[PDB]
Amino acid sequence: TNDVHLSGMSRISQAVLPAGTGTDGYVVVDATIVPDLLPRLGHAARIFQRYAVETLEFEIQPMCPANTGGGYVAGFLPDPTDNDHTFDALQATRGAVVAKWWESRTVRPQYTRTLLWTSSGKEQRLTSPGRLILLCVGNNTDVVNVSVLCRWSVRLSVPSLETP
Amino acid sequence: TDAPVSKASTVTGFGRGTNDVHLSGMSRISQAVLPAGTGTDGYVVVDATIVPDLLPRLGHAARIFQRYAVETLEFEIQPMCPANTGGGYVAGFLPDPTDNDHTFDALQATRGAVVAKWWESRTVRPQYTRTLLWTSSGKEQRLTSPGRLILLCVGNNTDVVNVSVLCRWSVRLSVPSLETP
Amino acid sequence: TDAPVSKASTVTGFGRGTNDVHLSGMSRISQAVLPAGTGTDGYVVVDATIVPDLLPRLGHAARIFQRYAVETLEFEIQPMCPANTGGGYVAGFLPDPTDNDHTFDALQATRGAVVAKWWESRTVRPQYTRTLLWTSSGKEQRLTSPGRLILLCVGNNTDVVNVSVLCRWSVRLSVPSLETP
Amino acid sequence: TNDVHLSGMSRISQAVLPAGTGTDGYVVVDATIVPDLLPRLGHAARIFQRYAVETLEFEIQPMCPANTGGGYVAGFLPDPTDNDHTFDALQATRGAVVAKWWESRTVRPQYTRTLLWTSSGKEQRLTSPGRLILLCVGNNTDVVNVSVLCRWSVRLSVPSLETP
Amino acid sequence: TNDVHLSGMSRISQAVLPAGTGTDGYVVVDATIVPDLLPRLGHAARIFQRYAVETLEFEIQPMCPANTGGGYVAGFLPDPTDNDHTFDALQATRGAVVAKWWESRTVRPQYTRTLLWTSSGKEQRLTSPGRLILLCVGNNTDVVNVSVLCRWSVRLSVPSLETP
Amino acid sequence: TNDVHLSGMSRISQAVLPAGTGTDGYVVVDATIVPDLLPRLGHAARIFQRYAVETLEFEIQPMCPANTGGGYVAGFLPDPTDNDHTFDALQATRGAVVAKWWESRTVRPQYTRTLLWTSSGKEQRLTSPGRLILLCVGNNTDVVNVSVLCRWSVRLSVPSLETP
Ligand SMILES: [Ca+2]
Ligand SMILES: [Ca+2]
Ligand SMILES: [Ca+2]
Ligand SMILES: [Ca+2]
Ligand SMILES: [Ca+2]
Ligand SMILES: [Ca+2]
């Protein structure tokens, strides 16, 4: 077997949220999980054709004063083609969390473990396991710098160099 | 205890909804009427793509689940006409949702296809994929539907024919969500 | 066999659909924002009648069932605001769906009512009818809903308050049908 | 072994019989069983040189009103070179059936199991196992659309592309 | 069972490269491997619904004089969607070969034995195992009649009948 | 484990040698084997800190007419620092080959499987396994398009991320 197991921590997305703009339902983070976003996996997927996600956890680590107001809801939609970004969709899914802006939380979602494709294509269900969505729950009193780390572990295969 | 700057949140049972439900039923996927003389050979009577939306009770249950897998799928062709009607029918289930071929040979090639007279009711026990399929629509139909059902006329019928295609199904829904088409 | 005048029908599995499904979840029945100063005493923050339509995932499952019975029903009041907000709230669940009284006494009288500060989250474990209730709407609300939830302010709040009322429910649907509102 | 076992249902021949033309001995169906007639086996024999029939049943499925008059006799002559189409030849053979026009019957004949040739040739005994013959027994009062399905099962060999 | 193992060789593409036009990077051959491309598999796929490529190899057999100064690079990209006509992209793929214009070579690539579909659809990744690309390396001196052959061994399934 | 075995072929260098310039001792190719030189290993080393070359071979594939009178000598010096462009120095190294300009050959050298560093530094002996040298033997007659390929199999370690 020529499968290469690669794993590690990496920050998929960082967002800045100025004070007073975090209204309810505001989409702070909306990231379709593909290996291109992941820093270390971006180079590994550039040299392979297919990958299979073996572990995926999203650690939301926001950095705001403890007296800041408002909260956030984070979830992982297993369907990359789904284009719904609301509290209802997040609360429906498994692994979703809701917490105050100064709390760091962990999202352990339900993701497909089949063999996906690193490259882009017409069918998004064949390239990504899902979409991470992080929304505001209430108005934030202070500016929030939110960073979403992602502990991943994939199994690459089929060596081939690829272009952006 | 003390009075902190901000107390920790205590939302406990979030993202722990029900994950798997088994749903069963038997619904009419098609109903057709043929006035005398239109049942020419090869005329397509029923062309129904098996999707959760086609099944009414499953249509709502598929709106709260991401992926479903078909466990049981059997079709019934019930022609409600007397035993003095000429001509006949051929019914089949193409496992490929994208296969749009409407001929006698294409139907007869599939496993479980039936050929009968217009006064004989039949049951199609087809070949379908047990793999998990996506409830919501996508770019490729082969990831969302187990197949297609085709019902054709074989001979020129003599009288008006009423034909009902029923489908006994049983699916297993997984990966909870809330689809908003 | 012989050739009769008309052959007998052979529809076998008709009217034998699934009868009972247990459905569970936890959904936000209400969400309110109070700018500073509007939290006057007795001001009604949340007034939600517990019906299957109010619960999103149950709304679709109730459209294919006639009667449902509530097995578990517990509400959570989550105020997402700091620990320096004045005033407080009272939350209760009136078992009578038609009881439209919004006062502190009416809420506190009910079993399981909670009184807390705006920086304390609470859980209401109320008294609800275990009897079978009709999914579809009718002339009398007491045959279709287990009760009503009321959340009121107790004191004048100092800061803007975000309050979310979540409801952990568990129902048993019976008597299959297809409701078309 | 590179033998490919292929089997399936397929309609060899459909015939329309107008009312009043089905006199006694009329040859409704006269089909020399070669893989070209069989729809799915037509494509399989186009890519192979030799085949051996392992199972052969002919299901006659006529579609006429139940009050129609007259009957049909169906048989399978094991000799493709034989050019006799009468009730005598059919009744002599094994597996022959006789039935009213509205009855569907099954013919389980006696066929050679040797290795035949898909392509045509001078000797017809080396290419086909036999000839299906379906005749009218009496005058038919109504128009009859008769279809002869064939449950077959062959064992192909010797890969080679072929032309009509 | 419905599984029918088939194998054989077939010329997927043939190209004629006149003298002087074989500049570096020129795309001599770009052929997406589909069942219709292979003659014997073209008929096999017309009578089945699914196929899985168990074995796949290619042979480049250029037919040029021994005084033809030039070279070619050949490789099987295991992703039908990927489109990159560069030397490094081909050489990255496993089994890719580089040779002179008067030397026949064999490509033994890597690919996933996933159960593909014999009929075309919106997504090419479900109907094709990949695509063979043959490029020029250096300017050729004489006319080259290149003929890429493919030795395949596939496993058909789900009996049906189709029209292209 | 952090160890990730990778392997593949990549063209380390390509040179064009015009007619008459291939005098004896001329240095056609002098390429220091570094991870950046190999495309697929270039991305693999950008996401790791250490690598050890488990297997390393080279193939010389000159592309010249069969009437090209001349010869080449190829060899892998296992010391990056050593700098000697002489025939005897190359032939001394294990696996060195001598051939005609129209004959592809394979170099299977000797080297130490020491855990090298993927990023450049002051000492080249810690970042490169060696250097391949290809010299002329005798004056060539026609233009030669030489392309040295390298088949490598390395073992990465110490996960990290780097920029070149
Ligand atoms: Ca790709
Ligand atoms: Ca969906
Ligand atoms: Ca009702
Ligand atoms: Ca032949
Ligand atoms: Ca198809
Ligand atoms: Ca470094």
Author numbering:
A (entry chain B), D (entry chain B), E (entry chain A), F (entry chain A): 52 to 215
B (entry chain C), C (entry chain C): 35 to 215
Paper text:
Nervous necrosis virus (NNV), a simple nonenveloped virus in the genus of betanodavirus, infects fish and damages aquaculture worldwide. The structure of GNNV VLP unveils GNNV capsid is a T = 3 icosahedral particle with a diameter of ∼35 nm and delineates the CP as consisting of three domains: an N-terminal arm, a shell domain (S-domain), and a protrusion domain (P-domain). The S-domain comprises an eight-stranded β-sheet to form a canonical “jelly-roll” structure as the building unit of virus capsid; three P-domains from contiguous CPs in one asymmetric unit are located outside of the capsid, presenting a protrusion at the quasi-3-fold axis. NNV uses protrusions to bind to common receptors of sialic acids on the host cell surface to initiate its entry via the endocytic pathway.
Specifically, we examined three pH points: weakly alkaline (pH 8.0) for host cell docking, weakly acidic (pH 6.5) in the early endosome, and acidic (pH 5.0) in the late endosome. By using three-dimensional (3D) reconstruction with icosahedral symmetry, we determined cryo-EM structures of GNNV VLPs at pH 8.0, 6.5, and 5.0, as well as virions at pH 6.5 and 5.0, with overall resolutions in the range of 2.82–4.36 Å. Cryo-EM images revealed a spikier appearance of the GNNV VLPs at pH 8.0 and 6.5 than at pH 5.0. Our cryo-EM results show the protrusions on GNNV adopt erect/loose configuration at pH 8.0 and 6.5 but become prone/compact at pH 5.0. Notably, the diameter of the GNNV particle under acidic conditions (pH 5.0) was smaller (370 Å) than under weakly alkaline (pH 8.0) or neutral (pH 6.5) conditions (380 Å). Thus, our cryo-EM imaging has revealed that GNNV structures are pH-responsive for the first time, with protrusions on GNNV adopting an erect position under weakly alkaline and neutral conditions but a prone position under acidic conditions. GNNVs dock on their host cells, e.g., Grouper fin cells, under weakly alkaline conditions as wild Groupers live in relatively warm oceanic regions that exhibit weakly alkaline conditions (pH 8.1) or under neutral conditions (pH 7.0–7.5) for farmed Grouper.
